[PDB]
Amino acid sequence: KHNMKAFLDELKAENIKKFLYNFTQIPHLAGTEQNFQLAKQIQSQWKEFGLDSVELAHYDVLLSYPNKTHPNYISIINEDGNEIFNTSLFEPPPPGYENVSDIVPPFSAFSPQGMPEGDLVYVNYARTEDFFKLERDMKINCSGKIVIARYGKVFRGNKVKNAQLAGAKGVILYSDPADYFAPGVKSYPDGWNLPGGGVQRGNILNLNGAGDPLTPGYPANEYAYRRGIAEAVGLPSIPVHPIGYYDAQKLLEKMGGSAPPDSSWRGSLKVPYNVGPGFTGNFSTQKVKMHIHSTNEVTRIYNVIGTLRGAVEPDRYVILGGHRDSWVFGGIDPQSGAAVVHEIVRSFGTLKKEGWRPRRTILFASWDAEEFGLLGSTEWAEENSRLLQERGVAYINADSSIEGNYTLRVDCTPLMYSLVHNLTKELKSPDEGFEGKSLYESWTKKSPSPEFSGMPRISKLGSGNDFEVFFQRLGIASGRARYTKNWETNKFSGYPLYHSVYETYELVEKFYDPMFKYHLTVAQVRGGMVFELANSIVQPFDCRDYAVVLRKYADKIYSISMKHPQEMKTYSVSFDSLFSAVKNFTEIASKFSERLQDFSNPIVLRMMNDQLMFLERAFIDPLGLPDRPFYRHVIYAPSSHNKYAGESFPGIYDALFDIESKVDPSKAWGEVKRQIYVAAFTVQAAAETLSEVA
Amino acid sequence: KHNMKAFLDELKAENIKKFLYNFTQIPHLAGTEQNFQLAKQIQSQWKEFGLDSVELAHYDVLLSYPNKTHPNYISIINEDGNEIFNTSLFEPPPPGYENVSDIVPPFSAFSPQGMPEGDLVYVNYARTEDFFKLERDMKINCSGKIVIARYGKVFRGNKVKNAQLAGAKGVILYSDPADYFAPGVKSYPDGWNLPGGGVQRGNILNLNGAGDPLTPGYPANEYAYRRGIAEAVGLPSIPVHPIGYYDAQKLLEKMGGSAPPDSSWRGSLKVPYNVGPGFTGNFSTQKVKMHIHSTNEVTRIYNVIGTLRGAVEPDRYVILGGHRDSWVFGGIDPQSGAAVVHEIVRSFGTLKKEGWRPRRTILFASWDAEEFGLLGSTEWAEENSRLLQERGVAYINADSSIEGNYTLRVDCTPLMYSLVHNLTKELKSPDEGFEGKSLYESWTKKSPSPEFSGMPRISKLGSGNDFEVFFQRLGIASGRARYTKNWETNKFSGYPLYHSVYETYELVEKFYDPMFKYHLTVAQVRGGMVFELANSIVQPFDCRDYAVVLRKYADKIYSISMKHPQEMKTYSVSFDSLFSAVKNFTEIASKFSERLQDFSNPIVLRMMNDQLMFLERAFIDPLGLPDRPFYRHVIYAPSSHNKYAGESFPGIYDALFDIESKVDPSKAWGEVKRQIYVAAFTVQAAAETLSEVA
Ligand SMILES: *[C@@H]1O[C@H](CO)[C@@H](O[C@@H]2O[C@H](CO)[C@@H](O[C@@H]3O[C@H](CO)[C@@H](O)[C@H](O[C@H]4O[C@H](CO)[C@@H](O)[C@H](O)[C@@H]4O)[C@@H]3O)[C@H](O)[C@H]2NC(C)=O)[C@H](O)[C@H]1NC(C)=O
Ligand SMILES: *[C@@H]1O[C@H](CO)[C@@H](O[C@@H]2O[C@H](CO)[C@@H](O[C@@H]3O[C@H](CO)[C@@H](O)[C@H](O[C@H]4O[C@H](CO)[C@@H](O)[C@H](O)[C@@H]4O)[C@@H]3O)[C@H](O)[C@H]2NC(C)=O)[C@H](O)[C@H]1NC(C)=O
Ligand SMILES: COCCOCCOCCOCCOCc1cn(CCCC[C@H](NC(=O)N[C@@H](CCC(=O)O)C(=O)O)C(=O)O)nn1
Ligand SMILES: COCCOCCOCCOCCOCc1cn(CCCC[C@H](NC(=O)N[C@@H](CCC(=O)O)C(=O)O)C(=O)O)nn1
Ligand SMILES: *[C@@H]1O[C@H](CO)[C@@H](O[C@@H]2O[C@H](CO)[C@@H](O)[C@H](O)[C@H]2NC(C)=O)[C@H](O)[C@H]1NC(C)=O
Ligand SMILES: *[C@@H]1O[C@H](CO)[C@@H](O[C@@H]2O[C@H](CO)[C@@H](O)[C@H](O)[C@H]2NC(C)=O)[C@H](O)[C@H]1NC(C)=O
Ligand SMILES: *[C@@H]1O[C@H](CO)[C@@H](O[C@@H]2O[C@H](CO)[C@@H](O)[C@H](O)[C@H]2NC(C)=O)[C@H](O)[C@H]1NC(C)=O
Ligand SMILES: *[C@@H]1O[C@H](CO)[C@@H](O[C@@H]2O[C@H](CO)[C@@H](O)[C@H](O)[C@H]2NC(C)=O)[C@H](O)[C@H]1NC(C)=O
Ligand SMILES: *[C@@H]1O[C@H](CO)[C@@H](O[C@@H]2O[C@H](CO)[C@@H](O)[C@H](O)[C@H]2NC(C)=O)[C@H](O)[C@H]1NC(C)=O
Ligand SMILES: *[C@@H]1O[C@H](CO)[C@@H](O[C@@H]2O[C@H](CO)[C@@H](O)[C@H](O)[C@H]2NC(C)=O)[C@H](O)[C@H]1NC(C)=O
Ligand SMILES: *[C@@H]1O[C@H](CO)[C@@H](O)[C@H](O)[C@H]1NC(C)=O
Ligand SMILES: *[C@@H]1O[C@H](CO)[C@@H](O)[C@H](O)[C@H]1NC(C)=O
Ligand SMILES: *[C@@H]1O[C@H](CO)[C@@H](O)[C@H](O)[C@H]1NC(C)=O
Ligand SMILES: *[C@@H]1O[C@H](CO)[C@@H](O)[C@H](O)[C@H]1NC(C)=O
Ligand SMILES: *[C@@H]1O[C@H](CO)[C@@H](O)[C@H](O)[C@H]1NC(C)=O
Ligand SMILES: *[C@@H]1O[C@H](CO)[C@@H](O)[C@H](O)[C@H]1NC(C)=O
Ligand SMILES: [Ca+2]
Ligand SMILES: [Ca+2]
Ligand SMILES: [Cl-]
Ligand SMILES: [Cl-]
Ligand SMILES: [Zn+2]
Ligand SMILES: [Zn+2]
Ligand SMILES: [Zn+2]
Ligand SMILES: [Zn+2]
């Protein structure tokens, strides 16, 4: 029989291992020849594997690269202007890769050029609250200073935005061992920790969903009209560069000025973590000087798009997409994901060769330039937006399959919660001590839901990955899953070697997943979700789960507002309309569920499948959120303080945020009321899409 | 049998006559009790007629009314400040209506209050080119002057916008006999001409598709957050008031200053049509003073929404909508349309009572507040936008059924051209001399297509009626049809008694359509289109007709640009991408048509019906046109100089318009190139929705 079990059984750990090795021997940086060659290889293999069509879709987008003959670095300079200390020009390459060429040195992509010299101010994680504390409580002025911030906690683009707004003239990012060195584990190559010479690459844009900085709204095709650089979306105005903790220690150790305000400002280095500005007395005349010479350059990128045509509903698309470009070797990010996608394609193609097809069309994507701002997925979705909004059932992301070896992690729309619970109950746990138990059991035990007994935690989608255009711009139900660490015994950020040269095949094979069993489990979860979404007669979405979360989010945003009872009285700020809309959504969803269970009629079925498919779409507001026109989903947007985190009722959240500091409270509370109206209207409008159609 | 013929045969001229008489005995001004009573009557009757559900959908919107105890008027004042001439406080009511109360006096809805005094400047029709001629060629400065403009040629909202931008401090609108008095016909009540005391009411907003000025984007429901007046959309900044030609003659006859520049500036009154500023020597110290005291007031309005549920595709909507609010009695506008809708509902309900239902759902709408800015249709569409964009097949408008008695007039999307040609070939001509001939034959003979032999003229949709939100905001295929005059023997504007108290049942019954046969023909055309759209197995849209017009519009916009060959060379302005996209659309449409003809499979059918339905939707750009976010259709928008007229490739048209006057030609030609890209991309994207889906 051709059923889910046949699909799942065909997936092999050893194939995923072979593919990951194949994908990680040389760098595959976006816009380089090596990554175009890998695109062509994947295209050829997906055709071999049996897909109906496999094409490259290319775009010409703004990318950023260091200047090979004028390297980026930072100095401490003395009074005479002699550079008495320089940061590294490259990470020491790992064993056996010391002769690999075309390793891009650490840099912050899209930094402008400049050579600013000045006094340092240390800004902790450069979060909104870190700058509040500096400016409001400590009265430290960052204007015209170079800021040094530790990585961690929030997206580094938000750090740079916050430093720019505080008036900084440059930003130095570094990895503190507090956040990237787990106690008791060895540095690479002897363990999975970040060595003192390791450095995290990464872009520092604030695109807010725009895609290619030069062509917001429209694909960067052959005839596209491009903005000039000065009108580009999301570029930073001040130079930025990342360093490791050996170099950081040399910059921090001389810091004077004010003491750190409390222990949450101290990392693990043997330095006082003084805030500055500038150095202690003996060194007060020394300064820090950046030298940044990277260039922004329009460059061709290539997505691979494979199609497995549906037997019954070929005009309904279930998309499995993940990126292929990497900063260096991409051992975890993204090739641990891409190898899993490759094996999923192979398994679906095996069934296809025996005469099976899924009910709906499945699209498979190998995106380019994710690392430079989700560029490949976003341009392709801009090109195909009309097809996607009228035919897109679901998008399942497939970046890094692992960031630890402890338990499952899933972030998804509420519409997929029931699907995920049901699928994981049918999958075997790969965990030690859970032999013969379901993945649901191990996952629920290790990661309990904060709200419900006997259920696992599933998070909201944030951003910083390729589902962003599909979910928050276009309103297509989206999900992602991977194996993760235990956050409770682990205070560190993501995984330590993230975006470093040390992220290699050997890192994964030796330290993360020697038997490829966590990868296989992740292929079963992503692959199984795609299988159900593409083959279930009725869409496997439960609108009732959206009703439950909408109530939770309404309670949450009301509770934020209720910190200001005087203002709510003065300005007549009521959440009544929002709770009313949520109550209505609950009632209508419950009645729709009864009809869905209670209807041989393919029109009523497809009418009902269309109501399920367009339910996520109903949360889109075509006017977007304030000053972020590509974040159109009214329930979820990436946090305005941290692109990685999701925020619920973001329009009301941002209206309330720091409202006690607004100079015109009438206007500010007016805008809170406006956002309440927009949210209540959108919830009620979404509910009404589930009412009887006539 | 229950087929189109049964539907059509049930329509009766005498019923339309009875309904028009019923609808026109008292005024039905938006927001008044009388129009709420009529809404309730129509709701009750539509239920009686057999519709499945008939509801009122109400909204609270900004309306405008004169102050009953402080009337609007205009004066000529002397040096001492004595008002030596005053314009009328009301139109002399017609015979037998001299005791009807609640006739709103002539006013310009949404005018601000004020009593500006100043010198007059006469500005012809107050068109963009009239102001170019005054300022650029004649060097006449309108700043701080009161402008007097004749009605006609363009929407009066555009006249007011143009006068405001020229620096006018008030605007007087009047009806010149050149434009509202057909030679050889008598004034009302003895003929259908405008008497010297007659005055055209009408709003002077520039909403650009926004709907209620206070709630752009969102329905004006019970909890809506409203803009303050100073942030409202589209309100005029200077007072405006309309007068008849007896009063106009008194204002114009003393005009001095410059002579009219040529005969196209002279109307038919016995005055020189001097441009001014101010009066001839003896009267040079006299001034004109306006007194405007109207108020803007949020007021409840009521749409009636009737539903005839589809038997097979109840989640596909064909909408027949027209408004019910009138300035006074609404003899032509809108009740000649509303009586036709009423009889269509009655006929469909007759078939329903015998057990028939249409394949798709038909929605019937009696909109309110059309006269105040398309408010009722637009708020309802804002409320229901998610249902409409995913389920809306077509919208057929139903305002005035007649504006003459000569031949048919149709304006519609190219997708309905074939449907209209085929339907009119099956209908009887009502014209004298065409007894026994089809409506197609009479219409084609009287109104030949400018492009094609043996076909009738069908125009683009402009705006200034209730299809605007459905077509240019939401991208739902739309059409309208009515009987019209012979434009060739008739230099006058619309019909003479438009928006005057003289537009009565008697005007229609005595002078326009005594036998109600043109009304019946119009009911057959609107009703027949709805019947086909709602019952044809395959949608009756032909995508090939869009390909033909897109080529015509591309040739047209290229020819405009080619007036500037030097600039096109300097700035490398190419239309190649647009012609390429149009060529591709042509090829893909031709192949889709073959598949449509060449496919027992209801999924392939509905998949194909969905491609037909979403084809108009594909021309929507969610970012809208520049500074007009509610005009989202890239092929058609209302002209930025005349809301009544449609413009094709409006984004490129407005980029090119008066470009030789722009101070930075590099920037201006850059924006032309940007609009070419947007248009070529949208055409290609629309074409791709017709490609095989996988
Ligand atoms: C959740 O669903 C419920 C329906 O189950 C829906 O209830 C609707 O609520 C509105 C209130 O927002 C009701 O509106 C009323 O309608 C009547 C006519 O039907 C009007 O007369 C009322 O207006 C008068 O009273 C107002 C309130 O004091 C005054 O402000 C006003 O000036 C008038 O005096 C009022 O407009 C509507 O009837 C119900 N609909 C029902 C019960 O079917 C509710 O709105 C939904 N929630 C959301 C957020 O949409
Ligand atoms: C109408 O439909 C046709 C298809 O029937 C479609 O043709 C496409 O045109 C584009 C050009 O805009 C072609 O793009 C080329 O693709 C190849 C790889 O396939 C690239 O190598 C080419 O780039 C090189 O050459 C350029 C031009 O000189 C240089 O600028 C560039 O730097 C590279 O050197 C180029 O990108 C595309 O292949 C075809 N697709 C086909 C034939 O299937 C056409 O675009 C459609 N019209 C519109 C308006 O969409
Ligand atoms: C409710 O009250 C809130 C209280 O606050 C506490 C909890 O909220 C915070 C939620 O944290 C979300 C996590 O933020 C921290 C973080 C995460 N990370 C891991 C980064 C892994 C990102 C990787 N994506 C990625 O590398 N993409 C590129 C490009 C992304 C882009 O350009 O958008 C990049 O990030 O550089 C991925 O998705 O796997 N690092 N720091
Ligand atoms: C290609 O080169 C162009 C050369 O230019 C020549 C041809 O282009 C011009 C096309 O003319 C379009 C007609 O404009 C002139 C006109 C039309 N009218 C008739 C008005 C009838 C409007 C009525 N609608 C209406 O009354 N709606 C209200 C409210 C509309 C609103 O608020 O949007 C109103 O107009 O006050 C209807 O649709 O029946 N008066 N003047
Ligand atoms: C990754 O695997 C691919 C597929 O096997 C390898 O590419 C093939 O290489 C062989 C031997 O050079 C060629 O004859 C084939 O034409 C290639 N097939 C393709 C490109 O589809 C590639 O060598 C492997 N890379 C590494 C680093 O092991
Ligand atoms: C840090 O690097 C800089 C730049 O390479 C070094 O300064 C240069 O030294 C060379 C050779 O002695 C001089 O000719 C250049 O004029 C210097 N350039 C600048 C910009 O000052 C510096 O010596 C290095 N410092 C350390 C401690 O290694
Ligand atoms: C997850 O599985 C549950 C349990 O099988 C499904 O809920 C059942 O669905 C069937 C089929 O409609 C109903 O007859 C049962 O009453 C349901 N049991 C319940 C609600 O406890 C549920 O549909 C599945 N979720 C999916 C497929 O998304
Ligand atoms: C327009 O027609 C309607 C429908 O016949 C008339 O309203 C009816 O009036 C009768 C007699 O007063 C009442 O008993 C009914 O209840 C009404 N039916 C409704 C409102 O649905 C109305 O009188 C007519 N108006 C004019 C001016 O002739
Ligand atoms: C035009 O109307 C105005 C306003 O009614 C007339 O002027 C008023 O005349 C009355 C009675 O004689 C005075 O008490 C008011 O003071 C005047 N008002 C103003 C604003 O001037 C005027 O007489 C009328 N002119 C004509 C020719 O009928
Ligand atoms: C208008 O009528 C024409 C003529 O009947 C229709 O065109 C025919 O459609 C049939 C059915 O598919 C084809 O087999 C014929 O070849 C067509 N004749 C032609 C193109 O000359 C046309 O479809 C109708 N338009 C509608 C329904 O929108
Ligand atoms: C990089 O630096 C070199 C060497 O100083 C310079 O000549 C060249 O212009 C730069 N390259 C780019 C792409 O800016
Ligand atoms: C911070 O520094 C600059 C002076 O160089 C000044 O313009 C700015 O206003 C200062 N802000 C403060 C002290 O709050
Ligand atoms: C793998 O799991 C073991 C057992 O808990 C743990 O000690 C080790 O730290 C894990 N490896 C990684 C990379 O997390
Ligand atoms: C209308 O004018 C009267 C009489 O002068 C005035 O008292 C009243 O305030 C005005 N009404 C409105 C609605 O402004
Ligand atoms: C028109 O009139 C005013 C003077 O009252 C002036 O400010 C404006 O610039 C003038 N424009 C001209 C003469 O072009
Ligand atoms: C009705 O038609 C006749 C015949 O052409 C014409 O003379 C008359 O002007 C028409 N009436 C109207 C209102 O157009
Ligand atoms: Ca783009
Ligand atoms: Ca509104
Ligand atoms: Cl992922
Ligand atoms: Cl109409
Ligand atoms: Zn990644
Ligand atoms: Zn990454
Ligand atoms: Zn009308
Ligand atoms: Zn009108």
JSON list of C-alpha atoms in Angstrom, two decimals, chain A residues 545-593:
[
{"chain": "A", "resi": 545, "resn": "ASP", "atom": "CA", "xyz": [-7.24, 25.57, 18.20]},
{"chain": "A", "resi": 546, "resn": "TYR", "atom": "CA", "xyz": [-7.04, 29.12, 16.78]},
{"chain": "A", "resi": 547, "resn": "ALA", "atom": "CA", "xyz": [-10.02, 30.09, 18.98]},
{"chain": "A", "resi": 548, "resn": "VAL", "atom": "CA", "xyz": [-8.22, 28.85, 22.13]},
{"chain": "A", "resi": 549, "resn": "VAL", "atom": "CA", "xyz": [-5.03, 30.81, 21.38]},
{"chain": "A", "resi": 550, "resn": "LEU", "atom": "CA", "xyz": [-6.87, 33.99, 20.35]},
{"chain": "A", "resi": 551, "resn": "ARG", "atom": "CA", "xyz": [-8.42, 34.06, 23.84]},
{"chain": "A", "resi": 552, "resn": "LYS", "atom": "CA", "xyz": [-5.01, 33.58, 25.45]},
{"chain": "A", "resi": 553, "resn": "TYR", "atom": "CA", "xyz": [-3.54, 36.42, 23.35]},
{"chain": "A", "resi": 554, "resn": "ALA", "atom": "CA", "xyz": [-6.50, 38.69, 24.07]},
{"chain": "A", "resi": 555, "resn": "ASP", "atom": "CA", "xyz": [-6.11, 38.07, 27.85]},
{"chain": "A", "resi": 556, "resn": "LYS", "atom": "CA", "xyz": [-2.37, 38.83, 27.48]},
{"chain": "A", "resi": 557, "resn": "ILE", "atom": "CA", "xyz": [-2.74, 42.15, 25.64]},
{"chain": "A", "resi": 558, "resn": "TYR", "atom": "CA", "xyz": [-5.58, 43.29, 27.93]},
{"chain": "A", "resi": 559, "resn": "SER", "atom": "CA", "xyz": [-3.32, 42.54, 30.94]},
{"chain": "A", "resi": 560, "resn": "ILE", "atom": "CA", "xyz": [-0.57, 44.75, 29.44]},
{"chain": "A", "resi": 561, "resn": "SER", "atom": "CA", "xyz": [-3.03, 47.62, 29.00]},
{"chain": "A", "resi": 562, "resn": "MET", "atom": "CA", "xyz": [-4.39, 47.14, 32.52]},
{"chain": "A", "resi": 563, "resn": "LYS", "atom": "CA", "xyz": [-1.01, 48.25, 33.94]},
{"chain": "A", "resi": 564, "resn": "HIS", "atom": "CA", "xyz": [-2.38, 51.78, 33.03]},
{"chain": "A", "resi": 565, "resn": "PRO", "atom": "CA", "xyz": [-5.87, 51.89, 34.66]},
{"chain": "A", "resi": 566, "resn": "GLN", "atom": "CA", "xyz": [-6.00, 55.72, 34.93]},
{"chain": "A", "resi": 567, "resn": "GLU", "atom": "CA", "xyz": [-5.35, 56.15, 31.22]},
{"chain": "A", "resi": 568, "resn": "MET", "atom": "CA", "xyz": [-7.85, 53.45, 30.24]},
{"chain": "A", "resi": 569, "resn": "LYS", "atom": "CA", "xyz": [-10.52, 55.39, 32.25]},
{"chain": "A", "resi": 570, "resn": "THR", "atom": "CA", "xyz": [-9.48, 58.81, 30.85]},
{"chain": "A", "resi": 571, "resn": "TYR", "atom": "CA", "xyz": [-9.41, 57.72, 27.25]},
{"chain": "A", "resi": 572, "resn": "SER", "atom": "CA", "xyz": [-12.25, 55.16, 27.45]},
{"chain": "A", "resi": 573, "resn": "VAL", "atom": "CA", "xyz": [-10.00, 52.32, 26.29]},
{"chain": "A", "resi": 574, "resn": "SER", "atom": "CA", "xyz": [-12.14, 49.16, 26.07]},
{"chain": "A", "resi": 575, "resn": "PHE", "atom": "CA", "xyz": [-11.11, 45.65, 24.95]},
{"chain": "A", "resi": 576, "resn": "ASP", "atom": "CA", "xyz": [-14.82, 44.65, 24.82]},
{"chain": "A", "resi": 577, "resn": "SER", "atom": "CA", "xyz": [-14.89, 44.48, 21.03]},
{"chain": "A", "resi": 578, "resn": "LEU", "atom": "CA", "xyz": [-11.86, 42.22, 20.90]},
{"chain": "A", "resi": 579, "resn": "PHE", "atom": "CA", "xyz": [-13.23, 39.71, 23.45]},
{"chain": "A", "resi": 580, "resn": "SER", "atom": "CA", "xyz": [-16.58, 39.80, 21.65]},
{"chain": "A", "resi": 581, "resn": "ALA", "atom": "CA", "xyz": [-14.87, 38.97, 18.32]},
{"chain": "A", "resi": 582, "resn": "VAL", "atom": "CA", "xyz": [-12.88, 36.11, 20.03]},
{"chain": "A", "resi": 583, "resn": "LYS", "atom": "CA", "xyz": [-16.11, 34.76, 21.60]},
{"chain": "A", "resi": 584, "resn": "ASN", "atom": "CA", "xyz": [-17.78, 34.86, 18.18]},
{"chain": "A", "resi": 585, "resn": "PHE", "atom": "CA", "xyz": [-14.81, 33.17, 16.52]},
{"chain": "A", "resi": 586, "resn": "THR", "atom": "CA", "xyz": [-15.05, 30.41, 19.20]},
{"chain": "A", "resi": 587, "resn": "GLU", "atom": "CA", "xyz": [-18.78, 29.83, 18.59]},
{"chain": "A", "resi": 588, "resn": "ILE", "atom": "CA", "xyz": [-18.50, 29.90, 14.78]},
{"chain": "A", "resi": 589, "resn": "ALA", "atom": "CA", "xyz": [-15.46, 27.64, 14.73]},
{"chain": "A", "resi": 590, "resn": "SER", "atom": "CA", "xyz": [-17.27, 25.12, 16.95]},
{"chain": "A", "resi": 591, "resn": "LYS", "atom": "CA", "xyz": [-20.26, 25.07, 14.54]},
{"chain": "A", "resi": 592, "resn": "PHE", "atom": "CA", "xyz": [-17.99, 24.81, 11.49]},
{"chain": "A", "resi": 593, "resn": "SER", "atom": "CA", "xyz": [-16.21, 21.82, 13.10]}
]
